[PDB]
Amino acid sequence: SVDLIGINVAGAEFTGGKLPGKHGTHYFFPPEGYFEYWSEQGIHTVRFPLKWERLQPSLNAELDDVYASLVDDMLDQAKENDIKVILDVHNYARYRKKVIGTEDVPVSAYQDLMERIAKRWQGHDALFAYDIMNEPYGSADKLWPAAAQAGIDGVRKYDKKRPLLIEGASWSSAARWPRYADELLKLKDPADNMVFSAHVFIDEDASGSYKKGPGKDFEPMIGVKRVEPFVNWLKEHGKKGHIGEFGIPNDDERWLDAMDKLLAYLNENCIPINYWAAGPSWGNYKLSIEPKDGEKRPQVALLKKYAAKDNCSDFGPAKAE
């Protein structure tokens, strides 16, 4: 049903300055055999970033044959290896650097993209859900709620079953969620399968760059404290939630303890998580959980412990009763 433990598989969105770019040089899809390792580890849900400009080089027009076919291939391999996939439009509420809702990118063009994504892949067994837009921020924040409704309407023309994952303003910050999220209360899903998805990192600025270590004033509950504003908003408003991104470096055991406390809190509240990140071409990336010679991935052992716990019947938090 709904797996509480999942991973991001990043690479198809890399090198945004090269459009269309070349597969194998600027961007990377999973090679053959890739999902076998993760299925063997007991991870069965993947969030998969995609670049809007590569999927649709022209607004309101057919999806790109080559790039969309690489998505086809990836979903085929996920199905072969018992993996369910959340497709993520990894675009910050922008197309070619212009905000959805401006003159150059009308909401109707965003609706068109989501229609074409759902039309092409709603019949694919490996597709689990649609994360309609990664991290709206900045000048896109005010227009994002209107764009979100258009994206919902686009998907629902072709897929009236699967969950829709709706991110929030300000990089979908979990910690700042209640500051801005009341504007999302007007969103409507006729299929009643809408889930809000927030992001959290536990470095000082919560950006995930980890410019410093935990420090002397480290609190093991830092992750819990940063998702509480989000989860409490969900409870107050009877909404369902999800954590689309969280990751830590592999070089300090204190980060692992905070990750453990966060996973325990999310488990108690039936909130799934997608670790950021695995992927076929991360190299030395400090948050990567992809196997690499000479690198230990203690985050994976922790995820595996939680992946064996019972899933919940649906996205939490549970309704008050």
Author numbering: 1 to 321
Paper text:
RBcel1, an endoglucanase of the GH5_5 subfamily isolated from an uncultured bacterium, has aroused interest because of its ability to polymerize cellooligosaccharides in vitro under near-physiological conditions. After the glycosylation step, the donor sugar is covalently bound to the enzyme within its negatively numbered subsites. Solving the structures of two RBcel1 variants, RBcel1_E135Q and RBcel1_Y201F, in complex with ligands has brought to light some of the molecular factors behind transglycosylation.
Tyr201 is a highly conserved residue among GH5 family members and is believed to play an important role in both glycosylation and deglycosylation. In a recent study, we reported that a single substitution in its active site, Tyr201Phe, stabilizes the formation of the glycosyl-enzyme covalent intermediate. The Tyr201Phe variant of RBcel1 retains transglycosylation activity, although it is reduced. The k cat and K m were 0.194 ± 0.023 × 10−3 min−1 and 0.077 ± 0.010 mM, respectively, confirming that Tyr201 is important in catalysis.
